[PDB]
Amino acid sequence: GKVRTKTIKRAARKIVENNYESLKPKDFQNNKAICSKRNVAIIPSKRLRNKVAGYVTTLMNRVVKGPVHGISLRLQEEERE
RNA sequence: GGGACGGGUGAAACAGGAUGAUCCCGCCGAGACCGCCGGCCGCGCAGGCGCCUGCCAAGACCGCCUCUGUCAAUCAAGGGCGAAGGCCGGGGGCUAGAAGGCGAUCAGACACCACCGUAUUCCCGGCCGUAAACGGUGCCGCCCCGCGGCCGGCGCGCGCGUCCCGCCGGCCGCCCAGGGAAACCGGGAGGCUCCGGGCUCUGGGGGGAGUAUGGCCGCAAGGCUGAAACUUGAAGGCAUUGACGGAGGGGUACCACCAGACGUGGAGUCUGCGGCUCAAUCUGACCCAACGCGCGCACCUCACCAGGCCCGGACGCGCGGAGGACCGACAGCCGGGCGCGCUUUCGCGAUCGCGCGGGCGGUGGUGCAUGGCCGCUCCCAGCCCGUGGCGCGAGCCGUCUGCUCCAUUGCGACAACGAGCGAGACCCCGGCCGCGGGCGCCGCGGGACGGCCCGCGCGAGCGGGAGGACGGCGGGGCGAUAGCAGGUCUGUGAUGCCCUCAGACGCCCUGGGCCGCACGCGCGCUACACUGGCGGGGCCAGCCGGCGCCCGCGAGGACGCGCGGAGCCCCCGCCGUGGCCGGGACCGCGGGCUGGAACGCCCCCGCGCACCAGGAAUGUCUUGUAGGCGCCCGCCCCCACCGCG
Numbered sequence A: 001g002k003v004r005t006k007t008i009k010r011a012a013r014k015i016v017e018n019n020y021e022s023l024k025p026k027d028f029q030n031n032k033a034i035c036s037k038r039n040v041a042i043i044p045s046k047r048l049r050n051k052v053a054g055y056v057t058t059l060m061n062r063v064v065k066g067p068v069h070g071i072s073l074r075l076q077e078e079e080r081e
Numbered sequence B: 001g002g003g004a005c006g007g008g009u010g011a012a013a014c015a016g017g018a019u020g021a022u023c024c025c026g027c028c029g030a031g032a033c034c035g036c037c038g039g040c041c042g043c044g045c046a047g048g049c050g051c052c053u054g055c056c057a058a059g060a061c062c063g064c065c066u067c068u069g070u071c072a073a074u075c076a077a078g079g080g081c082g083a084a085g086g087c088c089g090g091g092g093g094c095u096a097g098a099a100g101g102c103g104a105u106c107a108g109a110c111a112c113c114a115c116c117g118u119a120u121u122c123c124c125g126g127c128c129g130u131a132a133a134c135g136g137u138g139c140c141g142c143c144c145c146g147c148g149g150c151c152g153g154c155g156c157g158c159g160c161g162u163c164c165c166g167c168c169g170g171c172c173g174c175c176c177a178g179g180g181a182a183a184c185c186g187g188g189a190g191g192c193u194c195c196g197g198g199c200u201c202u203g204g205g206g207g208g209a210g211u212a213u214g215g216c217c218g219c220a221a222g223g224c225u226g227a228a229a230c231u232u233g234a235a236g237g238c239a240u241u242g243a244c245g246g247a248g249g250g251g252u253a254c255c256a257c258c259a260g261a262c263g264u265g266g267a268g269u270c271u272g273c274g275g276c277u278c279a280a281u282c283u284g285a286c287c288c289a290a291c292g293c294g295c296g297c298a299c300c301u302c303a304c305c306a307g308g309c310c311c312g313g314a315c316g317c318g319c320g321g322a323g324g325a326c327c328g329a330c331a332g333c334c335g336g337g338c339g340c341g342c343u344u345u346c347g348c349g350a351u352c353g354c355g356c357g358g359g360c361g362g363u364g365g366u367g368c369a370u371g372g373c374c375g376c377u378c379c380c381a382g383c384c385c386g387u388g389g390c391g392c393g394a395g396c397c398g399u400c401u402g403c404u405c406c407a408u409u410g411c412g413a414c415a416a417c418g419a420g421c422g423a424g425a426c427c428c429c430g431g432c433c434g435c436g437g438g439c440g441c442c443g444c445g446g447g448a449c450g451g452c453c454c455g456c457g458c459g460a461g462c463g464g465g466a467g468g469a470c471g472g473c474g475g476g477g478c479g480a481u482a483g484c485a486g487g488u489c490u491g492u493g494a495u496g497c498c499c500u501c502a503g504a505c506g507c508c509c510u511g512g513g514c515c516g517c518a519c520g521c522g523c524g525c526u527a528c529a530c531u532g533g534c535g536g537g538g539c540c541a542g543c544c545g546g547c548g549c550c551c552g553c554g555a556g557g558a559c560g561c562g563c564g565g566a567g568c569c570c571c572c573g574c575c576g577u578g579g580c581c582g583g584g585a586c587c588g589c590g591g592g593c594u595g596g597a598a599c600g601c602c603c604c605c606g607c608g609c610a611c612c613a614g615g616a617a618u619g620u621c622u623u624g625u626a627g628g629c630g631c632c633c634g635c636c637c638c639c640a641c642c643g644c645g
């Protein structure tokens, strides 16, 4: 469906800014594998994992198109001048 | 002139029309009225004031080195003005329109809507003297934050615009202090319990009652003034939370609608519900949220009706007792029956008898004394905490008048910040693939996420196309806070208080009843036929699952072993629109099963009821769904038109 509860959004944001290097803007498989990785997160279920991965994909392609509020993605380097 | 309707309403009907209406144009008559400009403009003591032209008197404001010199403020009595309606006497007569009449609507409608229409509405002369006559705020006078608009007059400045800087006067808006019960006022409702500028009027809980009785005024209608007895415990103001609205604005759902489908209410019958009857026909529940529901009533179950055995009276005190407490029996009757009772005489042995206290038990009452479990509100999306802030306070913000979502699901803001429950997540089932194991298909995992493309949208997210087993909440379970005088004391070693307790409401036996039938209605079943009924044959399921041989038309039965699945449908024939071979209620002979016991259930021959698709009224439903077809379990000695599947 389209139910993106608070948990999904908050978690996706949190795991994104700490892993911009290990993710990509449109893949669902590599994002899914990263979320399955234990060093970054612990998803007690499967469907939760898939939903989180999908929201991450949307979030990251939104970023690449342009900056997103609430994400401290190290962009200070481009704007520190 | 022209030729058929016109008027009026939500829709219509009364009045008008070939004697020419409605409609077009032109002329004539009379009487009202003064439009758009028209306003947080203005004038006036208030009531009130809007055509052109002319006349008469008046008024506030500003400007001033004009005059006088306290001449002032407020007021019983008294005087004058005073909307609309109304009255007297005269004029006038077009619009509207009290009264009246008539058509509709309604149960009624003498009212609201339609049409006709008198007084009145207009002018002169004169009475009346009331209005939510309201700023619901008396008049004179002083001080007082800030910003702004409009009107009239005067002055200053310049770059000369009907510019900007001021003064007086008036009409308005917002507002800091302060005030207040608050709404709110702030050009005071401020400067007041820190409670004294001057004058006048009014009020003292609610009704009775602005009534009675007097007086004055008035043609009248009526106005001014104005009690008591008696009665009563609240009546009122401003504000808060809910509920409600024939209020507005946004959303949503086949227990709502649109489009359609299948039905019920029509008959016969099964079952439950009220009424009648009876010895009894035991009782709970009555809109959704009672009525095949409280899991199949010949005995039990079982409570109710007519009759009878037993004590299974625990445990304590007093007395008595083996020189014999209590308990059983042949014959022969009475008795439904039994040593139940009776005419008698044999037994047994303290396991006790009687009285006084005290127990046990009871489908006995109260569900309006309770627990627990369910139902409903709710096929809902809502509910709250800590710190802080606003209010004397009940309370409010957080917890949203924007955009999305099935969803208080989210985005984005905000005297709020930060959390939590519910929702989702979660659990079971199914569909595709892999590994392993394997008497019998069953254990562990992968897979789908609004992920890709295109359009939009800041964003959350919306529409289309793909590829894919499956595409956007696939079917179920769980189920928030708060609550109902909802149901259950007849589910229980769950229970408070009552009532019964040795002719028992305890327990056990024999019968009867819960099923009786002039009547009203609730869930279902069978049919009304040819898109069919009968006869013969062929053939496939799943929750899951037991069979051979021999008798008998069959239903069933005697023996003996472990083995195993249907209706619709399809093919060939008969019948031929006839209440007929559709339908199978009712009744008359007969054969069997369960059981201690048929009133119960199966089979065979004959008889062959209502019924031609069902009035006012009403229910359910979106894919393997409706509908049609059958098959298993539950309760159960026998039996399913019911219920779960």
Ligand SMILES: [Mg+2]
Residues within 6 Å of the ligand: none
């Ligand atoms: Mg008048």
Ligand SMILES: [Mg+2]
Residues within 6 Å of the ligand: none
């Ligand atoms: Mg007054």
Ligand SMILES: [Mg+2]
Residues within 6 Å of the ligand: B195
């Ligand atoms: Mg005082």
Ligand SMILES: [Mg+2]
Residues within 6 Å of the ligand: B205
């Ligand atoms: Mg009084």
